[PDB]
Amino acid sequence: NAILSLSYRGGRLIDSSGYGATMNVGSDVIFNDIGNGQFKLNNSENSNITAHQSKFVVYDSMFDNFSINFWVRTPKYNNNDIQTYLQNEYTIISCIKNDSGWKVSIKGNRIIWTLIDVNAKSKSIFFEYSIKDNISDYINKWFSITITNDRLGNANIYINGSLKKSEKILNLDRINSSNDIDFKLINCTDTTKFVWIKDFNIFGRELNATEVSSLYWIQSSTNTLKDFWGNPLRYDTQYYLFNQGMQNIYIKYFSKASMGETAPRTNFNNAAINYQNLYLGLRFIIKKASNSRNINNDNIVREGDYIYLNIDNISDESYRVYVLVNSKEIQTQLFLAPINDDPTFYDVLQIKKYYEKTTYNCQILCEKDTKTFGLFGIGKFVKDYWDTYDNYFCISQWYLRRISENINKLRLGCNWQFIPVDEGWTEL
């Protein structure tokens, strides 16, 4: 029972809650109908949405509890402009009348919720994520934020469905907010900044932990395949390959053995920031296999589709990933070769999500028949001795049983993510 839910469908922004908020959209907003719909705000006057709430939805109360929820995708810092990134707080969503109400702000690597009462007393609570991780779960990635407010106790921030922070708000008096919610960058000094927003909802109660987790599961669209950024995985789109089990390597071509070998990610590191580079190694393109589901160019890949993994940066001609047919062994290297129909090898795959379905991981399956059946992962050249070069791109039957074992499956070597070049992640 959301009391406001923004959705973009049939080419228009609507309130899908049924409480009838009306929208006014500026001339410089980008929209799409992915899922419930997404939009992009840039740093200009015309890049704005105003949602006008009815008398029955607008918040004006000393005691009534309420929650808001949305997902955000905010770009990586510019390496040469970290001081302004860390120091500049800008609003992205606000509902303020005569200085009272609520607002969502970003300040670098922080997401901030602020409440201001009619006496100008204010309380803020923030979530901060690291800008020194080799690989970040949050930078330039879709993530979920749910903020719940108990007027007689705490404000709470939940990130990706789990409680991250709490702050006492009980000393605030009446919060008399605006009928209008403005989605708009305010006070953002960087002309190039933008933010992506999706799944904006308001609830007229304090959601509990169970409700927050359920909402996260629903909004994660667990049947859809996603890329590293949290966007739908697509055909005909160049992707670098990330292994969730071995995050510090990428795959390179080794011509002598028609092989994908591992090599260490390079990094950028100074006193303020650290990250490993993402746009490294073999560049893959997902292609629709013969007699699979009919698609248009750049369509979304589904778990039921049969696909090929082309590689466009080994030579001027396309290469593709091949599996040896009837290997009679538990593990074999994958073969990276020019396009061919040699019956010794086989190229029909599927991209699956067997567990951890709210994550952006996938598994890559070959299942021709029992003699050619396994999951893509990484094998060791030498097993009994720090060496980032000691591995190759393989297919193994070992993963088939492993993924049904009573274990944490988050960091298995058969977990992969696909990384397209994105405007919110620039590197050297």
Side-chain angles (χ1 to χ4, degrees), residues 24-40:
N24 185 328
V25 186
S27 44
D28 190 32
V29 181
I30 292 152
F31 290 104
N32 64 50
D33 70 339
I34 298 180
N36 296 318
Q38 319 175 335
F39 61 87
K40 185 196 186 185

Side-chain angles (χ1 to χ4, degrees), residues 13 66 73 130 133 140 146 162 178 210-211 213 218 245 267-268 278 294 309 314 338 341 367 374 381 399 401 413 416:
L13 196 55
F66 75 107
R73 195 163 84 86
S130 176
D133 294 338
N140 198 42
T146 305
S162 78
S178 182
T210 304
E211 297 170 314
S213 300
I218 291 162
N267 68 81
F268 181 98
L278 301 177
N294 295 309
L309 285 175
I314 291 173
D341 65 359
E367 187 179 334
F381 291 123
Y399 295 120
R401 63 185 187 159
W416 300 95

Side-chain angles (χ1 to χ4, degrees), residues 76-87 108-109 128-134 136 139 267-276:
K76 182 180 157 293
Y77 45 85
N78 293 294
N79 287 356
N80 60 210
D81 196 40
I82 280 289
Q83 284 187 323
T84 57
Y85 174 89
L86 287 173
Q87 320 319 342
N109 59 337
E128 188 174 355
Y129 51 83
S130 176
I131 55 175
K132 287 168 205 219
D133 294 338
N134 288 323
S136 170
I139 299 170
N267 68 81
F268 181 98
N269 181 266
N270 61 29
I273 64 225
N274 175 73
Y275 64 89
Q276 279 179 167

Side-chain angles (χ1 to χ4, degrees), residues 145-189:
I145 301 152
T146 305
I147 303 160
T148 74
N149 303 270
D150 177 4
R151 300 302 315 271
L152 291 180
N154 294 319
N156 305 284
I157 298 178
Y158 299 75
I159 298 295
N160 286 341
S162 78
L163 183 64
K164 291 308 185 185
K165 260 224 216 166
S166 296
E167 169 85 352
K168 173 191 80 174
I169 57 161
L170 64 97
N171 297 122
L172 294 177
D173 294 335
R174 173 180 300 282
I175 299 168
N176 178 7
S177 74
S178 182
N179 289 72
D180 292 341
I181 300 167
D182 294 343
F183 303 78
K184 184 176 178 194
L185 277 64
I186 306 169
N187 316 297
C188 181
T189 58

Side-chain angles (χ1 to χ4, degrees), residues 286-305:
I286 302 173
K287 306 296 308 180
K288 141 178 95 175
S290 318
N291 303 307
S292 198
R293 182 181 63 90
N294 295 309
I295 70 183
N296 290 110
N297 180 259
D298 290 331
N299 273 180
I300 296 173
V301 181
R302 301 176 63 92
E303 294 189 43
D305 299 353

